[PDB]
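User: Modeling request: complex.
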Amino acid sequence: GNSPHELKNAAQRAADWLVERQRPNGALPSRTAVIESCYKGMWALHTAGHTQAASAVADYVTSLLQPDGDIPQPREERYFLDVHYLYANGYLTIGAHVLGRFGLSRKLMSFVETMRNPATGGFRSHGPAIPGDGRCDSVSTSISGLAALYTGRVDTARSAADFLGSLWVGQPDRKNVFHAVADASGAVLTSDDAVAVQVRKAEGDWYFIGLPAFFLTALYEATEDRAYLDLATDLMTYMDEDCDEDAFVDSSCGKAGVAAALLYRLTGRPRYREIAEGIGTLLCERQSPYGYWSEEETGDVADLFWGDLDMTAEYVLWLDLIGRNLASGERVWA
Amino acid sequence: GNSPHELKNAAQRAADWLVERQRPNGALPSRTAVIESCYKGMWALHTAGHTQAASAVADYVTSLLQPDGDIPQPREERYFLDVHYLYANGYLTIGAHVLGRFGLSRKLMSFVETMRNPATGGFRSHGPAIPGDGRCDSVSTSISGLAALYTGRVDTARSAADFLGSLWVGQPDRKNVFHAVADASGAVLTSDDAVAVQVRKAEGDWYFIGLPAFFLTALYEATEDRAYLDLATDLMTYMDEDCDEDAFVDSSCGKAGVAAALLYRLTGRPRYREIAEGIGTLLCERQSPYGYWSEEETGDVADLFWGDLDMTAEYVLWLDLIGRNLASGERVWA
Ligand SMILES: [Mg+2]
Ligand SMILES: [Mg+2]
Ligand SMILES: [Mg+2]
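Assistant: Request completed. Predicted assembly structure:
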């Protein structure tokens, strides 16, 4: 596998690619003007040290911010409407906070908390303008708990972990399916219209498990409460031992990669280093020669379809996080 | 002056200089192994995108962390013992937190809060092992409030600002001296053993005013409480109009420059941009050809006296912060 330094070199190439093509208003080079194209941009560009570019994204985001602290438009992808609406808001909060844009992060995080279910601790899947039944999902809840950790709302993070532990315990058929949604009372939803990961098939969706593993490990680091470490390690064993190989190969595997890298630094267990090395090396290998990532395109393009742009910023972030946790883990343990 | 891109270029050269010479345990290349040589390193290296080097400083800092969350040793400079002990801890808390080292930042911040005076909101000048009279100073209080902002302990930040307001209002002779310290009841200390800036002389110590200006401006951004913007504005007016021109020339002027850059982004007042540009250009002009900053050193050296190492990391941070607030200020206002 490639070294932590090589993972970082790859992240820097993509960050440079984004910055070279950033628009004057600060938007990143997407073929459609949608918030799901650049919600990871502030955090990703800041970790690459492109802080003026990251601040320009913050300027762009601030120009879209509504009085309630939400960015309800522009949104087109329905996963950002009724599956995990807050997935955009969570990265926006973290990126704003780490940049010191404390007014933006306060407003964003306060809106996120209006979508918290006080009884289960989960976060609602569908946004305010989107009809739904109050279901909460593992991804909305996980990213919201992580944003709460960065903004110091540790009680909210703990309550999100309560939701996740209940989702985990209540699974009716864990060998074959992970049902990632609970209803407004906290019962696991097995409806056809609720997100369900096919555990023993190569059909993606793994970040509904991997993002919880990352968040729970971060929450353990913040509190040293072993209950959170226990659930994170149980989720990682599940993805490693019980899920299809696709869990570490699909484009959504980066979340588990970060979780394994962090678990490695915190516990020193060698399997966690291997998982994170393997995932980081895989993302590095898929990078296009010109510096971005794309499902289908390979040329010297000037912009990307929103999903590739998001994936490109996302891998800047995961390669950086995997890199620094593996490098520190080697210093601490080896 | 110099463009925001030019300031960032100087910061990046200095960060590269540091990282090339960083030691295997994570320590920065100081001729003496003291915490005051590298307390700004986590945050500075993170802003430069050098996240593996920043995390390596975190590993080093973590190895020194005591059970109470303090790093009482190694310390040698008196200013880090009984003038502003917590000045190290404050940057360490911010750098740990933005790196996601949430256990480190929680423990560091919680120790910082045990040195808060609950009656005045000030932070004690002398560490637990250092005999003293409970006096509290503007720098300890300012950096501790800023660390509270990054960690989401906003009530602690607001209480720090209350202290700074009492210190400002209580000045007995502000046209001639800025007494930066108060006793444990919050009365301004005028004894000869208490830090006093000779504001009509070119004799340094300006950061006892400039760091408060920066913190209060960030606290305004977090809360939108104009009382904090008002006090920041009065301190910047004071430094610009009542203080010797050395206030924007001395090595400690970077704090004021950052406050001015931030105030420019928030208010658009052109005088703030001029102050920030003037200070950033001055720092960029003083940089060595190799990347470090030093009062006396001019060779291609492998290490530095702790004060020069601290100053080099410090200018990486301030040039980055000035540059991105000036670049976004231009986008918003120009
Ligand atoms: Mg570069
Ligand atoms: Mg099994
Ligand atoms: Mg080209």
